[PDB]
Curated annotation (Swiss-Prot), chain A:
GO cellular component, one term: ribonucleoprotein complex
Protein origin, superkingdom: Bacteria
Protein name per its UniProtKB record: Small ribosomal subunit protein bS21
This protein's UniProt keywords: Ribonucleoprotein, Ribosomal protein
A GO biological-process term: translation
Molecular function via GO: structural constituent of ribosome
Gene field: rpsU
Native source species: Staphylococcus aureus (strain NCTC 8325 / PS 47)
Protein family (similarity comment): Belongs to the bacterial ribosomal protein bS21 family.
Keyword Cell cycle assigned: no
Keyword Transmembrane helix: no
Swiss-Prot record, chain B:
Molecular function via GO: rRNA binding; structural constituent of ribosome
Entries under InterPro entries matching the protein: Ribosomal_uS11 (IPR001971), Ribosomal_uS11_bac-type (IPR019981), Ribosomal_uS11_CS (IPR018102), Ribosomal_uS11_sf (IPR036967)
Functional description taken from the UniProt entry: Located on the platform of the 30S subunit, it bridges several disparate RNA helices of the 16S rRNA. Forms part of the Shine-Dalgarno cleft in the 70S ribosome.
SUPFAM superfamilies cross-referenced by the UniProt entry: Translational machinery components
The name this protein goes by in its record: Small ribosomal subunit protein uS11
GO biological process: translation
Keyword Ribosomal protein annotated: yes
Species in which this protein is naturally found: Staphylococcus aureus (strain NCTC 8325 / PS 47)
Alphabetically ordered keywords of this record: Ribonucleoprotein, Ribosomal protein, RNA-binding, rRNA-binding
Family: Belongs to the universal ribosomal protein uS11 family.
A GO CC term assigned to this protein in UniProt: cytosolic small ribosomal subunit
PROSITE patterns for this protein: RIBOSOMAL_S11
UniProtKB/Swiss-Prot annotation, chain C:
Name of the featured protein: Small ribosomal subunit protein uS7
Subunit description: Part of the 30S ribosomal subunit. Contacts proteins S9 and S11.
Function recorded in the entry: One of the primary rRNA binding proteins, it binds directly to 16S rRNA where it nucleates assembly of the head domain of the 30S subunit. Is located at the subunit interface close to the decoding center, probably blocks exit of the E-site tRNA.
Organism of this sequence: Staphylococcus aureus (strain NCTC 8325 / PS 47)
GO MF, one example: structural constituent of ribosome
Pfam families: Ribosomal_S7 (PF00177)
Gene: rpsG
Family matches, as InterPro entries: Ribosomal_uS7, Ribosomal_uS7_bac/org-type, Ribosomal_uS7_CS, Ribosomal_uS7_dom, Ribosomal_uS7_dom_sf
Family: Belongs to the universal ribosomal protein uS7 family.
Curated annotation (Swiss-Prot), chain D:
Full-sequence range covered: 4 to 104 of 190
Protein name in UniProt: Ribosome hibernation promotion factor
Subcellular location: Cytoplasm
GO molecular function, one term: ribosomal small subunit binding
Subunit composition and interactions: Interacts with 100S ribosomes during exponential growth, as 100S ribosomes decrease (after 7 hours) also found associated with 70S ribosomes.
Keyword Kinase listed: no
Family the UniProt entry places it in: Belongs to the HPF/YfiA ribosome-associated protein family. Long HPF subfamily.
Length: 45, 115, 143, 101
RNA sequence: GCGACUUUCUGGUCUGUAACUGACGCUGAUGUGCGAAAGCGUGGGGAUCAAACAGGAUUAGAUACCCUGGUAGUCCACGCCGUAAACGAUGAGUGCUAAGUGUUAGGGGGUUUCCCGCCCCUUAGUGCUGCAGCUAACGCAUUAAGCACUCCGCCUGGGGAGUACGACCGCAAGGUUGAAACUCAAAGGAAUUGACGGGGACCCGCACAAGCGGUGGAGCAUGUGGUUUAAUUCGAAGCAACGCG
């Protein structure tokens, strides 16, 4: 393993799931209508 | 003075802090290092360099007993969790893996609101 | 935007000495600045019998930092400082730390100072350090 | 502070009155080095009441202005302008910190 | 309004079939029933989140915005009120009115060795663009705000006020129905120029950065205000007046 990719690979499998947006989305609460609209206003970005 | 050379690590780089705890195979506590316990505060804990001296310390203090190989486990979404491990590899260890972790609920409950 | 060459110094066939004169050349009176400087040569080239260029290149390299910082609210960043500004830096901390010695004559404090940092002493080696202390204390919150 | 007024001789009740009512604003922030006032009278033939003033600032200055029938109502206007001015100028500003990388 | 899984019950929808009855339909006053969230009640239940609130910080001040905890509630049943930007700010039913474009459930057709690749047509639903035509303009445009018909509800300047009295309902908060006095000469919609911005983007500038030098600091000339005078002759005042006229 040594070094180099060890930090890049992990970063790759970590970038796939997207931990950032998954629990950042649940960082502060929202209404259901608002959330729905938000999700709608986007699908292929 | 429990000694092996393949322990395991649990990590957490919060928005406001980034800390360490090194445990054994099962495991159980041996040491930890608070960025705040290194004089820092505030956001000064949240900076990556705080985790350098911390993880260096509890890595060092833990290989006092003697530990080189290890496995790693990282929740705590924040900055330090990719720089201070480039300080970790300099710490005297032989990392065998690094496993992501994060608590995913399944629409469980409420967070706060403001702002 | 470029930077106002000196041809050479026609003393030593050097360049650096003129770059320093122009910081000492108060009132444009090079006659008196090159006066007090030539005095500086014979004096320091007497004490600890040597050359200028030895104590000069020595002591100018002993105070000269390789880092300093800058703000940008204001967050203070570490940077490898660029070389000519690093030159005029060593020059400036040198002379501006020099005159505050509480010493009468044009030159004795100067040679005292370059001889100071020649042995890794003096407050300009000290400020070099504190620059190199803030720097690497300045890596956390800014790098 | 600087008070020159044409076609009229100033008095003293207006001084304590106006300058005290200006002093009320050290809520924010006063900061009271200069306060230049300015007046004149001007036949129309309804024929005037000029009420003009600077209230300069740290690193900047200002202007409030008014013309009236009368100095009391006409003055309550050199004040209840500067108030809103000084207030904003302090709000402002920008702190909502936010780490980076 | 309805998004873990399964089963039990269970209504409704679209296709083609058209063989069955043979105009049996449409609307719908009065009426009766469902009905977000809050909320009241009887109890239960109570992990998070949380009005009220306790405390902390900030602000001149802040009962607020921010942090920590924190009750009612948020949750289940049984009930009750029955309202809303309950908005596609568009009543329902029918029939005609240019194309193109995805997309959903289905049908039929062709294409390929067999369509699994493909296309054609069609039915219902679904969104985007876009002609006539309409519209004060914005926009609409086969799911019309077009063209015409049947029925229902509504409106007649604004403030007064959906307030008041009265009546009905409701445990109560309140709901529904819904005035007039007096007052005004407008209220208002759409669209344009400019102004503003504690909105955004781009650029320039001794505006920055960088550095050097300066003032204020002590003594001298001088303009102003304040003083005073019999006179201190008169004017101009942020930059743009105070070594000026």
């Amino acid at each position: 393993e040594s070094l180099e990719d060890a930090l890049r690979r992990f970063k790759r499998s970590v970038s796939k799931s997207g931990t950032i947006q998954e629990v950042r989305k649940r960082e502060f609460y929202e209404k259901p209508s608002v959330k729905r609209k938000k999700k709608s206003e986007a699908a292929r970005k | 003075k429990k000694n092996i050379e393949n322990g395991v690590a649990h990590i957490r780089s919060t928005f406001n802090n980034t800390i360490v705890t090194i445990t054994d195979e099962f495991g159980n506590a041996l040491s930890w290092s608070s960025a705040g316990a290194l004089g820092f505060k505030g956001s000064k804990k949240s900076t990556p360099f705080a985790a350098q001296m911390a993880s260096e310390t509890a890595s060092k203090s833990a290989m006092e007993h003697g530990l080189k190989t290890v496995e790693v486990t990282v929740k705590g979404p924040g900055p330090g969790r990719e720089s201070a491990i480039r300080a970790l590899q300099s710490a005297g260890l032989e990392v065998t893996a690094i496993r992501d972790v994060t608590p995913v609920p399944h629409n469980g409950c409420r967070p706060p609101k403001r702002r | 935007v470029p930077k106002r060459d000196v041809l050479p110094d026609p003393i030593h066939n050097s360049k650096l000495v003129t770059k320093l004169i122009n910081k000492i050349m108060l009132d444009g009176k090079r006659g008196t600045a090159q006066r007090i400087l030539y005095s500086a040569f014979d004096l320091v080239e007497q004490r600890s019998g040597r050359d200028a260029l030895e104590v000069f290149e020595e002591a100018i390299n002993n105070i000269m930092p390789v880092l300093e910082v800058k703000a940008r609210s204001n967050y203070q960043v570490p940077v490898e400082v660029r070389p000519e500004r690093r030159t005029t830096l060593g020059l400036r901390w040198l002379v501006n730390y020099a005159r505050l010695r509480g010493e009468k004559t044009m030159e004795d404090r100067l040679a005292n100072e370059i001889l100071d940092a020649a042995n890794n002493t003096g407050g300009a080696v000290k400020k070099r350090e504190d620059t190199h202390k803030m720097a690497e204390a300045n890596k956390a919150f800014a790098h | 502070f600087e008070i020159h007024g044409d076609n009229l001789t100033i008095t003293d009740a207006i001084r304590n009155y106006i300058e005290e009512k200006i002093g009320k604003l050290e809520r924010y922030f006063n900061d009271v080095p200069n306060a230049v006032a300015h007046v004149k009278v001007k036949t129309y033939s309804n024929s005037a009441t000029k009420i003009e003033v600077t209230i300069p600032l740290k690193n900047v200055t200002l202007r409030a202005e008014e013309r009236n029938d009368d100095l009391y109502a006409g003055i309550d206007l050199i004040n209840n302008k500067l108030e809103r001015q000084v207030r904003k100028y302090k709000t402002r500003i920008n702190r909502k910190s936010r780490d980076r990388g």
